[PDB]
Write an enzyme that holds these catalytic residues in place. Structure first.
Site, PDB file in Angstrom:
ATOM      1  N   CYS B  23      67.163  50.474  32.935  1.00  0.00           N
ATOM      2  CA  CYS B  23      68.539  50.111  32.997  1.00  0.00           C
ATOM      3  C   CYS B  23      69.481  50.949  32.106  1.00  0.00           C
ATOM      4  O   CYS B  23      70.615  51.170  32.566  1.00  0.00           O
ATOM      5  CB  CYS B  23      68.762  48.642  32.512  1.00  0.00           C
ATOM      6  SG  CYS B  23      68.217  48.314  30.796  1.00  0.00           S
ATOM      7  N   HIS B 119      69.016  43.790  28.801  1.00  0.00           N
ATOM      8  CA  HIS B 119      69.436  44.515  29.986  1.00  0.00           C
ATOM      9  C   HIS B 119      70.781  45.156  29.724  1.00  0.00           C
ATOM     10  O   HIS B 119      71.776  44.567  29.301  1.00  0.00           O
ATOM     11  CB  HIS B 119      69.538  43.566  31.197  1.00  0.00           C
ATOM     12  CG  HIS B 119      69.847  44.239  32.504  1.00  0.00           C
ATOM     13  ND1 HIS B 119      68.987  45.134  33.116  1.00  0.00           N
ATOM     14  CD2 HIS B 119      70.918  44.053  33.300  1.00  0.00           C
ATOM     15  CE1 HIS B 119      69.534  45.421  34.288  1.00  0.00           C
ATOM     16  NE2 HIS B 119      70.704  44.825  34.438  1.00  0.00           N
ATOM     17  N   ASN B 140      76.410  46.273  37.271  1.00  0.00           N
ATOM     18  CA  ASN B 140      75.039  46.043  36.890  1.00  0.00           C
ATOM     19  C   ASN B 140      74.181  46.952  37.759  1.00  0.00           C
ATOM     20  O   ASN B 140      74.319  46.894  38.977  1.00  0.00           O
ATOM     21  CB  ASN B 140      74.735  44.529  37.277  1.00  0.00           C
ATOM     22  CG  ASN B 140      73.309  44.238  36.927  1.00  0.00           C
ATOM     23  OD1 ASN B 140      72.442  44.968  36.476  1.00  0.00           O
ATOM     24  ND2 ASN B 140      72.949  42.927  37.219  1.00  0.00           N
TER      25      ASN B 140
HETATM   26  C1  LIG Z   1      66.624  47.296  30.821  1.00  0.00           C
HETATM   27  C2  LIG Z   1      66.133  47.014  32.224  1.00  0.00           C
HETATM   28  O1  LIG Z   1      65.541  48.024  32.776  1.00  0.00           O
HETATM   29  O2  LIG Z   1      66.498  46.060  32.863  1.00  0.00           O
HETATM   30  C3  LIG Z   1      65.439  47.854  29.910  1.00  0.00           C
HETATM   31  O3  LIG Z   1      64.473  46.913  29.874  1.00  0.00           O
HETATM   32  C4  LIG Z   1      66.004  48.304  28.549  1.00  0.00           C
HETATM   33  O4  LIG Z   1      66.324  49.472  28.178  1.00  0.00           O
HETATM   34  N1  LIG Z   1      66.116  47.288  27.674  1.00  0.00           N
HETATM   35  C5  LIG Z   1      66.493  47.392  26.326  1.00  0.00           C
HETATM   36  C6  LIG Z   1      67.772  46.752  25.959  1.00  0.00           C
HETATM   37  C7  LIG Z   1      69.075  47.106  26.536  1.00  0.00           C
HETATM   38  C8  LIG Z   1      69.330  48.574  26.021  1.00  0.00           C
HETATM   39  C9  LIG Z   1      70.108  46.012  26.021  1.00  0.00           C
HETATM   40  C10 LIG Z   1      65.475  46.870  25.303  1.00  0.00           C
HETATM   41  O5  LIG Z   1      64.743  46.016  25.774  1.00  0.00           O
HETATM   42  N2  LIG Z   1      65.136  47.651  24.313  1.00  0.00           N
HETATM   43  C11 LIG Z   1      63.879  47.647  23.609  1.00  0.00           C
HETATM   44  C12 LIG Z   1      63.082  48.579  24.498  1.00  0.00           C
HETATM   45  C13 LIG Z   1      62.439  49.526  23.549  1.00  0.00           C
HETATM   46  C14 LIG Z   1      61.334  50.202  24.349  1.00  0.00           C
HETATM   47  N3  LIG Z   1      60.767  51.012  23.274  1.00  0.00           N
HETATM   48  C15 LIG Z   1      61.076  52.362  22.732  1.00  0.00           C
HETATM   49  N4  LIG Z   1      60.175  52.590  21.726  1.00  0.00           N
HETATM   50  N5  LIG Z   1      61.971  53.409  23.141  1.00  0.00           N
END
Ligand SMILES: *[C@@H](C(=O)O)[C@H](O)C(=O)N[C@@H](CC(C)C)C(=O)NCCCCNC(N)=[NH2+]
Ligand SMILES: *[C@@H](C(=O)O)[C@H](O)C(=O)N[C@@H](CC(C)C)C(=O)NCCCCNC(N)=[NH2+]
Lengths: 173, 173
Positions: B23, B119, B140
């Site tokens: 996302c 998300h 979205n």
């Molecule tokens: C969003 C989705 O695809 O629906 C996806 O899960 C996502 O990026 N979620 C994020 C939060 C949004 C940026 C508010 C989140 O869950 N972040 C933690 C994910 C970290 C994954 N780990 C690393 N180490 N890069």
């Protein structure tokens, strides 16, 4: 300008070609997006799928062979076929009605140290104009719009002033 | 329905989110495409840029942190800033007029074994309705269209029936 227009239903331009050698990736992504009615294919992802080990400028500028284009379509649930000429207006009409995409393989008329660059484009459909001319509607990846090509002529004038001979076609995307 | 509409000029939906955790890649690609007036960014390419070593399902489902989102914008010539709340209607109006994109960081109200999925979504602009309501227009990534959210409410109802609390914003794409 048209009295009859037959196009691939869900074809949409979603990206255009900048400084890279990924014309066939652009062309196959747009044809598969249209025949599957999806938005998931993009040129960069096609290219990375077929050339997983190339990096940097080699990745940026290495194009595809027709064999690589045919294998890509087979991996995405199609059975593309090579036709060693330009498709006729009637062929385009029937394939388009059947939701089958056609890639154009073109060779540049203008030369550069004796070499004729190759460039792939997509067929979008076909049309009959008000004066009776039978035309094929084409999308060249560099443009944000379509061109209309008289079906009797195998050399397409493109938007930068060059000309590409349509020498073979891959249909069935 | 609107008496006043202020949107990011060249925002266009070019892809939607299927079965992956990308996302924030979708959201930043659409905001950078709009503020730069380009079509070159796509979620898969953002994700591969930030997670070059992950493969298979790990690549498919690992999302981003806010730090990764801020570093991505810095690498593409922007200076995103984290705001630890929902932007107000006036803030959205002024940032949108200045061609600055805003990412929404949302947290699911509905739980699953005590965890609230995160998300990310994009702001498209803002509008004042004929009855005077002040709203923010949102995209979205799962949808092929926009939603309108009353600016006084920090919980956005999304298209599958879930609700996401807008808890922080990253602006400046
Ligand atoms: C969003 C989705 O695809 O629906 C996806 O899960 C996502 O990026 N979620 C994020 C939060 C949004 C940026 C508010 C989140 O869950 N972040 C933690 C994910 C970290 C994954 N780990 C690393 N180490 N890069
Ligand atoms: C087209 C372009 O980006 O404008 C790009 O150069 C391209 O794919 N060209 C092709 C021909 C079209 C498919 C007609 C071509 O030049 N093919 C030979 C390139 C082969 C590169 N090598 C390998 N080994 N995959």
């Amino acid at each position: 300008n048209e009295q009859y227009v037959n196009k691939l239903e869900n074809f949409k331009i979603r990206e255009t070609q900048g400084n890279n050698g990924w014309c066939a990736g652009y062309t196959m992504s747009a044809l598969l997006n249209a025949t599957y009615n999806t938005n998931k294919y993009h040129a960069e992802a096609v290219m990375r799928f077929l050339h997983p080990n190339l990096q940097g400028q080699q990745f940026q500028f290495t194009g595809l062979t027709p064999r690589e284009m045919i294998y890509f379509g087979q991996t995405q649930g199609r059975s593309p076929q090579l036709l060693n000429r330009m498709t006729t207006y009637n062929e385009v009409d029937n394939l388009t009605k059947n939701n089958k995409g056609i890639a154009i393989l073109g060779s540049r008329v203008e030369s550069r140290n004796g070499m004729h660059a190759g460039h792939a484009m997509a067929v979008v459909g076909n049309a009959k104009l008000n004066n009776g001319q039978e035309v094929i509607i084409i999308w060249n990846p560099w443009d944000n719009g379509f061109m209309t090509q008289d079906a009797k002529n195998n050399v397409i004038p493109v938007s930068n002033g060059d000309h590409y001979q349509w020498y073979s076609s891959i249909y069935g995307y």
